[PDB]
């Protein structure tokens, strides 16, 4: 249920970001576009350097990234800044892959990201009232 909703949002964001195209999960995506695009624009150069270091070879070479996304939270801190920074890098990575192969898909990547968030941060996510909290946290 919470996995399903996260995967929807994350996948859709990543999917737009790569293809350039297109209740509460609906606002979570608006928020994601607004904020995520910000961090990608703001840190395009750092993401690029990191992306080159990922040696990510194909739509399924997501294990290096998953290792990375895990060590982020490896200090005991979770916040939406980190979470949203992870998804933005996911989008930034999703866009590169199409440069490399217009065919390749974002599913493995969306699932990679969701796995780490939902399955290792479940309790934290829950404590925050879920994507409702994320939406509230970034309200304008």
């Amino acid at each position: 249920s919470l996995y399903r909703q996260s995967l929807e949002i994350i996948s859709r964001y990543l999917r737009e970001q790569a293809t350039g195209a297109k209740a509460t999960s609906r606002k979570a995506l608006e928020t994601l576009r607004r904020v995520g695009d910000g961090v990608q624009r703001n840190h395009e150069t750092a993401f690029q350097g990191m992306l080159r270091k990922l040696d990510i070879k194909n739509e399924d070479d997501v294990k290096s990234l998953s290792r990375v996304m895990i060590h982020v939270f490896s200090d005991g801190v979770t916040n939406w800044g980190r979470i949203v920074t992870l998804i933005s890098f996911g989008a930034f990575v999703a866009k590169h892959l199409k440069t490399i192969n217009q065919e390749s898909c974002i599913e493995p990547l969306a699932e990679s990201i969701t796995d780490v968030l939902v399955r290792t941060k479940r309790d934290w996510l829950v404590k925050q009232r879920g994507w409702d909290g994320f939406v509230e946290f970034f309200h304008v």
Binding site: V35, V39, L54, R67, M69, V72, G81, V84, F138
Partner: peptide, 27 residues
Amino acid sequence: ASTKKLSECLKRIGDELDSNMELQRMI
């Protein structure tokens, strides 16, 4: 290996972004 270098980078941006919202919220 270098995984610690990349996670440290994303960690910072996330915190940077978090610090910015935490502020915009306190006011």
